[PDB]
Symmetry: C4
C-alpha cells in the first residue's frame, strides 16, 4: 500500500548515475525545442522517477526565452519529464502553474504543489492525481514559497515545508501535513526556527524526517529541521559542523560560539542537499555537498560524516570534487528512489547555464547516488551559453 522508508541499499560513497543536458541541443543548426528551466529536482514512485522543474512557458531557441532569469511570474509552471528523457517540448508534462514547487508520491498517487499568485497574497495549491485537493494561503503575505525539491510521504501522509516572510530576516517555516493533497494539519517548527528556505528532506528512519535548509539571512550554517511523524512535532536546529555548507560562508571553523551561534556574516545563501544511509531504526551515515568556492556558486564538493550534524562541530570527511571550481553550480537537491528490497538516496546538482544578469538562464542536472566506496568522476557541461541560439 502506502510508501514508507526502508533500510537503504548498501553504499559508502557517492557515484554518478546520469546527467541531463538539454541545451547541448540548442546550438546553431540544431533541431530541438529545449526547455529552459530552474529549480529542478527529482521525485520517484515505485514505477518511475521523474525530473521536475519550474519552466517559463517557452522553449530555447525562441524569441521569448529571455525571461528565463525571472523568479516569479504568471508564466512559470511546475513541469516534469520521465527521468532519462531529455528536456524537450514534446517530452514535457505540465502539472500546475506557479513559481515555487514540490512533489512526492505516497505509494498510490502523486501530490504536486506550487505557489501561485502575487507576492503579497500567494496561494499554494496541491494537486493529488488529477484533482486540486488542497489550498493553503499565504500567512505572512510576503512570498509564500516551498522546497524546490521533493516532499516526503510516510504511511499515506505527506510532509511539505513552506515559509513566508522576508528573505533577509526572520521567516518562520511550517510543516504542512497532507492526505490525498488536502492540508489536514500544520506542524509548528520549534527550537531554532527563525529561517529555513528551500529545504531538502529525507527520511532518517521508519518514522522521522530530516530537512537540510538555507538560512538566507543569519548564518552560513545550514538549518536542520527534524520531523517526528508519529508525534506530529518538528524542531529546528543549526548544523554544527565546522564544515559550513552554505554559500557565501567564512573559513571553516571560524564561527565562534555554540552550535546554534549564527556567526557574523550569513546574508544570502543557496539551496543545499544531503544523502544518507539508514536502517529502519537510525541513520548511520550522512553525505553532504557544498560549493568549491566560499563566495561564489561554483563547483561542488562531497563530504560525509557519521556524527549527529545537530550536535558535533567535527569537520566533515572529504569525499572529493564532483564539479570543478571553474564550473557554475547552483542548487542541489536530495531525493530518494524507493525499491522493493531497499531504498536509495541521491543528490542532484543544478549546473547553471546563463548568458548573464537578467539574460537567458537554465541548467544541466547531474545525479549522484549512495553506492560504492569512492567518488567515481566529476561532471562537466561542455555548454558555452554564448553558443546557445
Amino acid at each position: 500500500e502506502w510508501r514508507f522508508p526502508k533500510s537503504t541499499c548498501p553504499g559508502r560513497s557517492l557515484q554518478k548515475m546520469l546527467q541531463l543536458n538539454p541545451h547541448r541541443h540548442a546550438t546553431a543548426g540544431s533541431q530541438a525545442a529545449t526547455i529552459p528551466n530552474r529549480e529542478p529536482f527529482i521525485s520517484c514512485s515505485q514505477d518511475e522517477c521523474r525530473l521536475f522543474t519550474l519552466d517559463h512557458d517557452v522553449s530555447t531557441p525562441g524569441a521569448y526565452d529571455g525571461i528565463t532569469w525571472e523568479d516569479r511570474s504568471k508564466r512559470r509552471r511546475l513541469v516534469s519529464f520521465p527521468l532519462g528523457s531529455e528536456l524537450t517540448l514534446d517530452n514535457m508534462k505540465v502539472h500546475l502553474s506557479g513559481w515555487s514547487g514540490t512533489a512526492c508520491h505516497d505509494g498510490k498517487e502523486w501530490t504536486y504543489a506550487t505557489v501561485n499568485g502575487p507576492d503579497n497574497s500567494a496561494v499554494m495549491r496541491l494537486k493529488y492525481g488529477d484533482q486540486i485537493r488542497g489550498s493553503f494561503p499565504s500567512y505572512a503575505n510576503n512570498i509564500l514559497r516551498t522546497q524546490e525539491s521533493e516532499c516526503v510521504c510516510i504511511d499515506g501522509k505527506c510532509y511539505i515545508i513552506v515559509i513566508d516572510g522576508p528573505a533577509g530576516g526572520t521567516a518562520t517555516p511550517k510543516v504542512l501535513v497532507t492526505r490525498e493533497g488536502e492540508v489536514t494539519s500544520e506542524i509548528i517548527v520549534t527550537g531554532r526556527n527563525k529561517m529555513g528556505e528551500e529545504c531538502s528532506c529525507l527520511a532518517t528512519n521508519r518514522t522521522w524526517i530530516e530537512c537540510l535548509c538555507r538560512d538566507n539571512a543569519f548564518s552560513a550554517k545550514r538549518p536542520i529541521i527534524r520531523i517526528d511523524t508519529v508525534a506530529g512535532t518538528a524542531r529546528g536546529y543549526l548544523m554544527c559542523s565546522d564544515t559550513y555548507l552554505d554559500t557565501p560562508r567564512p573559513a571553516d571553523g571560524s564561527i565562534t560560539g555554540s552550535c546554534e551561534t549564527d556567526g557574523t556574516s550569513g546574508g544570502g545563501g543557496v539551496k543545499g542537499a544531503f544523502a544518507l544511509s539508514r536502517t529502519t531504526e537510525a541513520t548511520t551515515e550522512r553525505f553532504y555537498v557544498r560549493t568549491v568556492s566560499s563566495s561564489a556558486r561554483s563547483g561542488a564538493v562531497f563530504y560525509k560524516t557519521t556524527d549527529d550534524p545537530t550536535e558535533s562541530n567535527n569537520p566533515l570527511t572529504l569525499i572529493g570534487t564532483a564539479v570543478g571550481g571553474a564550473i557554475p553550480m547552483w542548487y542541489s537537491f536530495s531525493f530518494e528512489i524507493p525499491g522493493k528490497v531497499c531504498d536509495q538516496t541521491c543528490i542532484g546538482l543544478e549546473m547553471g547555464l546563463t548568458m548573464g544578469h537578467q539574460l537567458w538562464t537554465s541548467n544541466s542536472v547531474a545525479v549522484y547516488c549512495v553506492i560504492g566506496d569512492n567518488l567515481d568522476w566529476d561532471s562537466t557541461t561542455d555548454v558555452v551559453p554564448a553558443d546557445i541560439v
Copy 2:
C-alpha cells in the same frame, strides 16, 4: 463500473490549475510544430484528463495555417492531447473529422462525437472506443452542431446537446441519449426551448444534469437546460440573475420583466461556462464566468451564487478578475474531474490569439477549479500574434 456523479471535493472559490500556451513556441527561431486550434475543452476519465479541440490539419509555423479562422471545412478534426502535454504535432491524437465536437467517458470507454458534412446536410458520427457506433443526421438542415465541451455520462448512458437551425433565430436543441456511442433516444427540450447553442453541462446531483448555453438570437441572459436522466425529460429555462452572463449584454438588471423575458437586445453571444459544488442530493453553490467587457470578448470575471439560477434575479457575488479586460477571452467551458473519493468541477478559458479578421487564429487555455476560499491570480498569455512566424 459506470461513471456516476459523486459529491464534490470541498471548495468555495476558483483557483488556477495550469495553462497551456503552445504558440509561445511559434516565434522566430523556435523549433516546434504547434497546433493552432479553436473551440477547446477538457474531458476526463478516471485514468487521465485530455485537452480536446478542433484543429485545421496544419501546424504553426507553416504555409497553410492561414485557414485557422474558419468555422467549418473539410480540414477540421476533433483531436486531443493528454492534459499537460503541450499542443504540438507529435503529441496530437486525431479522433474524428468534423467541425463541431464533444466527448465524454462513461467509465469504460470514450465517446467522441463530431458533426461532419455540408451545412445543409451534416451528420453527427459518434465513435465509442475505436468504432463508429452512432450516426445522427441533420433534422433542420441548417448546420447541425453540438456543445464544443464535454458531454455527461451517468450509469452507462451519455447525454449530448445538439442544435440545428438558424443561428439568428429560433433553433430547437435536442438531448441525444447514447449507449456505447449508439443514439438510443432523443429527449425533447420543453419550456424555454427556442435557443441553446454550445451548452456547458455538469451533473447537479446523482441523477440530474444542468447545461448553461448561449442564446445567439434573443437574449443576453443565458439559457439553462436541466435534464432528469431517470425520467428522461429535459426543460429549458432562462438564467434569471441581474448579472447577465453573455457577451454582448446590456447593463446589469436593465432587462425589464420576468425571468424568461428576453430583453430588447440579445443578438450574438459567446459560449459560456459554470462550475459547482454538490452533494449526492443537490447543488449547493454555483460559480460563473463572464467577460470584463459588456460589448467585446475580452477579460474574464468569476462570480458565485447559492441561489437557484432559474428563479432568482439576485445579482451574483463577485469573486474577481481571472483575465484582465485588455486580454482577449473567447469561449469558456465546464468540465469535471472524477475522483475515487470526490469529484471536482472546473472552468477552462479560451484566451484567444489572432492576427485579425480572416487571418491566423488560435488560443491559450487556462484552467481554474473549485477549491479554496479566494481567487489566487489572474492569467495572461504574453503572446503577441505579430511575433508568430
Copy 3:
C-alpha cells in the same frame, strides 16, 4: 482468447471517420519531419488500431526524399503509427525491412509480414510479436509480393494472400496459413486463379473470408477469392457486376459474355477495397469503391449491393462520391475494427500526392466506415505538391 469474426455493428452506408494528412506539415516554415510513404493500410487489435505503410527510410522535407516513387529497394520498411497519430518521424515504429507488406492481430500478438530481397529471389519473413517466426521463399522467382492491406486471423490462424510471377500475365496466388507467424500450410486457390494482386480481405461470417483483388493483366473485373478456413480450401471468382471496379476499365456492362469472361481490355489496374455487413452466418450487404475516372486514378465513388458478387451481373447501387474526380485517388484498402459487442468494417483511401514521374510521392489517408444511412461528405487534401519543400 483468439480473435474471430462477430456480427457487424448496424449500418447501411459509409460515413467518414478521420483523415491523416502529414504533408500539410511539410510546407515552407514548418517544423515537422513528415514520413512520405505509399501502400498504406490499417489493422486493429482489441486494444488499438494502427496505420501501417511502406516507408523509404527518409522524412520530408529532406535531401533524400526523391526516391519515394520507387516500388522496391533496400530502403523500404513496413512501419506503423497508432491510428490518429500524425505520420511524423518520432511517431513511427519500424517493424520489418521490405517492400510489400501485410499485418494482422490474432487476439494475442501481431503478425507482421514483408517481402524482402531481389526481384528474382525475394523472401517473405513473418514476425510474431518481436520474433521472426516464419519465412517463405519466392516460388516463381518473379517479385514475390503480398496484399498491401491487413491479413485476417480466425481462431489463432492467420490467412495471407501472396502472389509471384509476371505482373502482365498469369500469376497464381496462394493462401498462406500461419500460426504464431510460422507458415503451417499453403492453400491452393482453385477456380478462376490466373491473377490476384493486392487483395483486400474480410471475413464474411464466422468461418469464411472473401478477398477483392486486382487482375493486372486480363480483366477490368476484379478477382474475388473465397477461403473456407474450416475445410482449408480457397476458390477464385471474377466479380460479375456490370459496375466494373478496376481502373482502367471499359464502360459499365460492355464486357460481353459470362461472369468469368475477361473482356477485351484489362491491362493494368489498381488495388481495390470493399466493406460489408454480416451476421455470424452470412454477409448481408457489401460496399464497394472505384475511381470516378474510368481511365485515371482519380476520385472515389461508393456503391453497395445485396447480391452475391460472384454470380450477379446487376449494376451496383450508387452511394455517392467520396473523393471528387479532380483529386488523385490511388489504392484503397479494407480493414476491420474488432469490438466487444460487434465488429465494424471500413474502407481507407490513399489520396495520392506527387510532384510527377520519378519524383517525390506520398499520400493522405481518408477512412470511411459502415454506419448510418447516407454518405456524409467527400474528402479533399488541400495539399499542393509544389508547396512541399
Copy 4:
C-alpha cells in the same frame, strides 16, 4: 518468473529483420534531431526489445556533434530506444553516464551497467530498475571496460564480461555475477585467458553461456569464453576454425600450429558476433560474421558451422554477403529475443558512417536473425557523410 534459455525457434540461416538509419534524416532541409552514437546493441525483455547505444550528449545536426569520434569522455551515456523507434532526441532514454556499456533483463527488471571515470581509476556502476545497486572498481587501473553488447541472465543472476589492462598486451577478463544489480561474485576465467575484449555472449543451453570476443593484441582468431553458471566456472579458448573472424587477419588457414596458437600477426581487432540454434541440452548450429576485407572494417559475410568452434579447424560454411565490401562495417553484436514458446538469436551490424579521422562519427544498425534456409538480401545505408549538415 526468471528468464532462462529455451530451445530456439526453427531456423537454418540468417535473414533480415529491420534497419535503423537515423542520419538519413540529418540532411539539408530535414527537421530531425538525430542521435549520433557508437557501440550499439540490442537487448530484450519478454515485453519489448530495445536498441542501446553510447551517445555523446548531442544531436545531429548541431554545433557540438564533432566530438562523436571519441571513445571516452564525460559526455557519453548509455541510452536506449524502443526497438523500431528511430534514433531521435525525443525517443531517447538515458540510463547511465559512462563510456562502455552493457544491459540485460532478468525476467523482472533491467540491469544496466556502464564504466565511468578516468582511464586509471574507472568504476562500473550497475543500475537495477531505477536504483544503482552495484559498483565495481577498476582492478588493473587501465581502462576498465565491458562488452558493448547485452549481458546474459539465467535464473535471476546475470553474467557480465569486463576487462582491464593494456589493449595492446595481456589483459585478463573477469565474469561478474550479479543479483538485482549487486555484484555477488567474480568468476576467474581459466585456460586461454590473456585477452578478451568486447565479448558477444549467448546461452548455449539451459545452463551454459558462450562468449565470442576480440583479442586486440595477439591473434586474428577470436577468443571464446564458456561459462558454466551452475558450477560457477569459466574457461577461455581460441576459435580454431581456419576461417579467422577478426579484422585485420591473415589468409584463411595460414596460422600454423594448434588451435590455441596465436599466429604471427594479431594486433588490432574489431568486436565480433555470432548466433546459434540450440535445444535445452546443446547448441546444434552456430552462425558467424566477419568483414569482407581482411584488412579494413568493410563488408559483412555470414558463415555457419555444426562443429565445436573450440576444437575444429574446419573452414566455416559460407552463407553469403550481408553487407557489400564497399560499405563500412564496424562492430557486430549478438542478441537474443525471448519468446513464450521459443527463443531466437540474432546478429546486429554497426554500419559505420563518418566524415573521417577525428570528425563526425555514427552508424546505421541492420539486424539479421536465425530463420529460414538462405540469406534473403544484403543491406546498404545510402547515407553519404558529406551530405550530413
